Design a protein around this ligand. Structure first.
Ligand SMILES: [Zn+2]
Length: 86
RNA sequence: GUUU
């Protein structure tokens, strides 16, 4: 516990600041593959929750990607395997 | 700080 399924070829990205949009994240992660979707999680009024997910069409090594130290806006993004809690 |  907690029960969760690890989502293949998807990376959790947290520490997403308000000036970082989906397109900027896609442009960075394109170094790893053909990005299928970047989704920043927002509440129903479009307030970002400050985290999102990047998924790929190609198989990627999520463990290697999450070692990356990515710093756009002065803080390291917080990366992890993507889990859907069940 | 893990998507419904
Ligand atoms: Zn930027």
């Amino acid at each position: 516990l907690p029960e969760g399924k690890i989502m293949p070829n998807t990376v959790f990205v947290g520490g997403i600041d308000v000036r970082m949009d989906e397109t900027e994240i896609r442009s960075f992660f394109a170094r790893y593959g053909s990005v299928k979707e970047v989704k920043i999680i927002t509440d129903r009024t479009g307030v970002s929750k400050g985290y999102g997910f990047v998924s790929f069409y190609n198989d990627v090594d999520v463990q290697k990607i999450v070692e990356s130290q990515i710093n756009f806006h002065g803080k390291k993004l917080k990366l992890g395997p993507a889990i859907r809690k069940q």
